Amino acid sequence: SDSAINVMKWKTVSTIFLVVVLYLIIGATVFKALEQPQEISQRTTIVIQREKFLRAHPCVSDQELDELIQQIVAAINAGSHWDLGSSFFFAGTVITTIGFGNISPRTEGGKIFCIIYALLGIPLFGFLLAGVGDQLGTIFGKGIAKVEDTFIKWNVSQTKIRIISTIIFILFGCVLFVALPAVIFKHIEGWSALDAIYFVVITLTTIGFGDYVAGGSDIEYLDFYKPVVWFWILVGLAYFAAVLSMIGDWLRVIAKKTKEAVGEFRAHAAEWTANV
Amino acid sequence: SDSAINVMKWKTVSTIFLVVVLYLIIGATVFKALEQPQEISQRTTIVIQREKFLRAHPCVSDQELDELIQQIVAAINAGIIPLGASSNQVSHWDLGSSFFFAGTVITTIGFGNISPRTEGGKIFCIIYALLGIPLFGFLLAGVGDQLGTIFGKGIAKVEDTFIKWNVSQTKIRIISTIIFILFGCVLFVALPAVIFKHIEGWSALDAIYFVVITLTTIGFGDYVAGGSDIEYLDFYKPVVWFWILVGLAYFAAVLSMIGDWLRVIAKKTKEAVGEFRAHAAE
Ligand SMILES: CCCCCCCCCCCCC/C=C/[C@@H](O)[C@H](CO)NC(=O)CCCCCCCCCCCCCCC
Ligand SMILES: Cc1cc(Cl)ccc1OCCNC(=O)c1cccs1
Ligand SMILES: Cc1cc(Cl)ccc1OCCNC(=O)c1cccs1
Ligand SMILES: [K+]
Ligand SMILES: [K+]
Ligand SMILES: [K+]
Ligand SMILES: [K+]
Ligand SMILES: [K+]
């Protein structure tokens, strides 16, 4: 029965859908809980700054200030960040689906070329990202081969070592691809320890908020700083690519433990019910 | 044999790397060619607006005036309505917008228009995405499967209609691939674009632009459906959410198709180069 297999699939999809919808509701409340207060204090202090500017300076009134604000808002639409170097940056953001968006095409023509460029670029880059990831994955293979002959054969059996190996991949991976670049971002880019990691994650996950852009701030980079972040991204995006895939498998493993843990809990409702 | 193929793989990756390097170069030159002129005309006229306002009031704090703008821009990263008229203010972290924000996180669209300002929200965003992204991955795959089978039912209808005697199985696949694109761009691109134009006030190009930038998960943020306050009947926002679920599913397959074409154009060109080397000399 073909429609029976499809009923099993829609049952699976529909539950995950709710888990997602539920995951959204939970997060939506946690963010508002965290961000709501700062918005009020920050939005109240900005109000004190308008009232203080007209009081401190009789020179300016409400008639000139509103006209001023209208010009700054328009300045948001504009912002050279389209020079040879920044555009090459823009292209990278386009084909990686990071899209920080701080610099986006404002021309009807640039919008058309961006569309085409993206549709052709993103798949192209995917092949590269696949090879880079494959290379890095095999490099990792040579490393664990050296480690699997030292202290794998000794005490603990090989059945539980696969758990130890996965921890090594995360340890080093976090150090090289997260820790080191975050350290560098802090000093060079001036970002706090947290803001550094925040950038690393929101970037290598292709989220790309744009609130933190390494090399985006306008002042004083080193000669080879920008080229090194490019390489970090090519290899960084591949790392989270695997990491995100691993976390995915953790979920399909767990999803079963909870699904049978619910069958257990119902079971010992069942017989516990018949013994009464 | 094991290490032989390894040496062979690096050969392919290195060539693709260079192709990408060259692809970024050509792109960079094409964007700055398009965007550089308008950047200049806008940056010269803005200087005209600052000079026009400098001599306007001799009693201004001249040098400290440019410091004020720095404070406004620094405040623009977060939602700010700094105007005397209509002091009433709408929250961008309310229950409805924060829900949106989470959707942008787990879909890796990241419009960035509204991002966490708090050290706590940032630490939760990290955890949220790391677990959220992979989770939403399964959903998108499930919605990819469902939407796919519903298509397999539709083509099973047309494959017995146009089918006649003396037909080839390999050539009909090209027909199906076209109808997939056709109806796809209609429902998930054409239809939503038109709605975006009227309801959201966007131009026909800005709507398509938004769609492509969004459903490819690029997420500039320069255009966001439902961003401005306007009215939003509320028959609208829920739809957009659904469109996103399926629209992301659609491009996922579309983008994966283009990759197959590129791979194809890759072999034809690679043997076309072997042909040209074979003969070409004469
Ligand atoms: C942290 C912010 C978000 C919090 C996470 C909210 C998740 C709430 C969902 C709880 C899961 C129980 C719901 C019932 C599910 C069952 O009908 C079903 C099989 O019957 N199980 C699954 O689908 C498989 C369920 C797979 C569960 C995946 C979510 C696990 C996240 C655990 C959160 C730990 C974070 C701690 C900080 C590092
Ligand atoms: C942060 C980042 C993202 C990608 Cl997708 C690729 C490379 C990259 O490395 C930083 C260098 N940054 C620049 O070169 C800039 C020019 C104009 C503003 S920043
Ligand atoms: C473009 C987009 C992307 C995702 Cl991932 C999810 C939803 C979404 O748009 C739909 C409704 N929009 C809202 O509910 C808003 C609240 C505040 C600004 S928009
Ligand atoms: K993005
Ligand atoms: K963005
Ligand atoms: K993305
Ligand atoms: K992706
Ligand atoms: K983005």
Record the tokens describing residue B45, joined without a space.
């006229």
DSSP secondary structure of A101-135: -SS---SHHHHHHHHHHHHHHHHHHHHHHHHHHHH
CA B52 to chain A, closest CA, distance in angstroms equals 11
Q: How far is CA B73 from CA A21, A103, A198, B80, in A?
A: 35, 15, 22, 10
Three-state secondary structure string covering chain B? CHHHHHHHHHHHHHHHHHHHHHHHHHHHHHHHHHHHHHHHHHHHHHHHHHHHHHCCCCCCCHHHHHHHHHHHHHHHCCCCCCCCCCCCCCCCCCHHHHHHHHHHHHCCCCCCCCCCCCHHHHHHHHHHHHHHHHHHHHHHHHHHHHHHHHHHHHHHHHCCCCCCCCCCHHHHHHHHHHHHHHHHHHHHHHHHHHHHHHHHCCCHHHHHHHHHHHHCCCCCCCCCCCCCCCCCCCCCHHHHHHHHHHHHHHHHHHHHHHHHHHHHHHHHHHHHHHHHHHCCCC
Tell whether A216 lies on the interface with B, counting CB pairs under 8 A.
no
| Interface-testing mutation among A50, A114, A178, with chain B (most B C-beta atoms within 10 A) | A114
List, in sequence order, the alpha helices (H) in chain A.
2-56, 62-78, 84-95, 108-147, 161-174, 180-189, 193-204, 225-274
Q: Which atom of ligand 1 is nearest to the CA of A30?
A: 2
CA–CA dist B99, A32 (Å, integer): 9
- Residue A208 sits at φ, ψ, to 5 deg, of 70, 60
CA–CA dist B33, B26 (Å, integer): 11
CA angle, residues B28, B29, B35, in degrees to nearest 5: 85
Q: How far is CA A189 from CA A79, A196, B121, in A?
A: 20, 9, 21
Q: Which atom of ligand 1 is nearest to the CA of A23?
A: 6
- Among residues 91-130 of chain A, which lie with CB inside 8 Å of chain B? 91-95, 97-101, 104-115, 117-128
Taking a C-beta distance cutoff of 8 angstroms, is the pair B244, B224 a contact? Answer: no
Picking from B35, B134, B219, the nearest residue to A101 by CB comes out as: B219
Nearest residue on chain A to B62, alpha-carbon basis: A59
Taking a C-beta distance cutoff of 8 angstroms, is the pair A217, A115 a contact? Answer: no
Task: List Cβ neighbours of B241 (8 Å cut-off, separation of 6 or more).
Answer: B103
Picking from B80, B135, B205, the nearest residue to A111 by CB comes out as: B205
Q: Which atom of ligand 3 is nearest to the CA of B103?
A: 5
Contact A39 B9 (CB under 8 A): no
CA angle, residues A127, A118, B73, in degrees to nearest 5: 120
Burial of A55 (0-12, 13-18, 19+ CB in 10 A): exposed
Q: How many Cβ atoms sit within 10 Å of the Cβ of residue B239?
A: 14
Pocket lining: B254 vs ligand 3, CB cutoff 6 Å: no
What is the torsional sign of CA B36, B114, B135, B146? negative
CA B44 to chain A, closest CA, distance in angstroms equals 12
Entry resolution (Å): 2.8
Taking a C-beta distance cutoff of 8 angstroms, is the pair A194, B119 a contact? Answer: yes
Task: List Cβ neighbours of A259 (8 Å cut-off, separation of 6 or more).
Answer: none
CA–CA dist B202, A4 (Å, integer): 44
Side-chain-facing half-sphere of B75: CA atoms under 13 Å? 22
Pocket lining: A251 vs ligand 1, CB cutoff 6 Å: yes
What letter does residue A176 receive in the DSSP assignment? I
Q: Can you give the residue ranges of every domain in chain A?
A: 1-276
Q: Residue B31: which of A111, A181, A205 has the closest Cα? A: A111
Residue type at B272 in one-letter notation: A
- Residue A99 sits at φ, ψ, to 5 deg, of 50, 60
Looking at domain B1-282, which CATH architecture does it have? Orthogonal Bundle (1.10)
- Residue B181 sits at φ, ψ, to 5 deg, of -65, -45
What letter does residue A222 receive in the DSSP assignment? -
Record the tokens describing residue B146, joined without a space.
């469902």
Tell whether A173 lies on the interface with B, counting CB pairs under 8 A.
no
Contact A65 B84 (CB under 8 A): yes
Record the tokens describing residue A273, joined without a space.
């019910």
Pocket lining: A229 vs ligand 2, CB cutoff 6 Å: yes
So what CATH class is A1-276? Answer: mainly alpha
| Interface-testing mutation among B2, B8, B20, with chain A (most A C-beta atoms within 10 A) | B20
